[PDB]
């Protein structure tokens, strides 16, 4: 906003593991306030991904988020007589949130049967560098590289 910057609100970590990252992920995944359903879904999919790919839920989740993590986004500047799609770096919270959002969106788009299965499949694909999430990440990276002529 114009006037001032604000203070950040606290988010309670999850009970299963205590990860604020997982808490934010479930808060992004939930809808209409059904946090219980969101927690059930995320926990089921995470346990599935863990027993699939070996290492525990935290390791799988963080490697997937790292493979989906962006570094440079693009913004509009509109300085003077010309408009510019300037690329700008991203901060940690922003890139984590964007990764989570792209992951949940890819899961929603996936035409599997259950949401837990969709999410687990998307997470595995991201860990192995596949899926619409990493696709969009590469697309935005390419766009930033193209518009790299602005600083």
């Amino acid at each position: 906003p114009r006037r001032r910057v604000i203070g950040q609100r606290k988010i309670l970590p999850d009970p299963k593991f205590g990860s604020e990252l997982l808490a934010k992920f479930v808060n992004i995944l939930m809808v209409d306030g059904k946090k219980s359903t969101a927690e059930s879904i995320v926990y089921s999919a995470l346990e599935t991904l863990a027993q699939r790919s070996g290492k525990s839920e935290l390791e799988a989740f963080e490697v997937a988020l790292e493979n989906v993590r962006p570094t440079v986004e693009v913004k509009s500047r509109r300085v003077g007589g010309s408009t510019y799609q300037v690329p700008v770096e991203v901060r940690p919270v922003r890139r984590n949130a964007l990764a989570m959002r792209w992951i949940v969106e890819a899961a929603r788009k996936r035409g599997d049967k259950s949401m837990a299965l969709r999410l687990a499949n998307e997470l595995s694909d991201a860990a192995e560098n596949k899926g619409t999430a990493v696709k969009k990440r590469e697309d935005v990276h390419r766009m930033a590289e193209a518009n790299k002529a602005f600083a």
Binding site: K148, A149, F150, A151
Partner: protein, 117 residues
């Protein structure tokens, strides 16, 4: 082909594009690159990054001649005045002289009329 260690880098920076020409001390050209052939057209052509990319490409092209010492002669205004020289230094040519050869007339031919945009 022959090899030479001392050369000149004629930079022609315009408000729209940027040309880079590596040549021998006798003006005999060896290789050239432009921001319009480096993949940037229109609004990206008149940028310093495109000029530096063009300088890198010209260095890669003239690499065959094995050039070490290089004197730069810059002409005309535009972004491609310092970024291209920086890209040359990065490519690793021993800069020797940095001259300005911008043609400044002494009240000669009159310029065109003003643009009423």
């Amino acid at each position: 082909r022959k090899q030479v260690s001392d050369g000149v880098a004629h930079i022609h920076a315009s408000f729209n594009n940027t040309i880079v020409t590596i040549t021998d001390r006798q003006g005999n050209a060896l290789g050239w690159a432009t921001a319009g052939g480096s993949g940037f057209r229109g609004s990206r052509k008149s940028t310093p990054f495109a000029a530096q990319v063009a300088a890198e490409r010209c260095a890669d092209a003239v690499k065959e001649y094995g050039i070490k010492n290089l004197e730069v002669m810059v002409k005309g205004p535009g972004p491609g005045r310092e970024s291209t020289i920086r890209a040359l230094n990065a490519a690793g040519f021993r800069i020797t002289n940095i001259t300005d050869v911008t043609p400044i007339p002494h009240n000669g031919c009159r310029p065109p009329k003003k643009r009423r945009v």
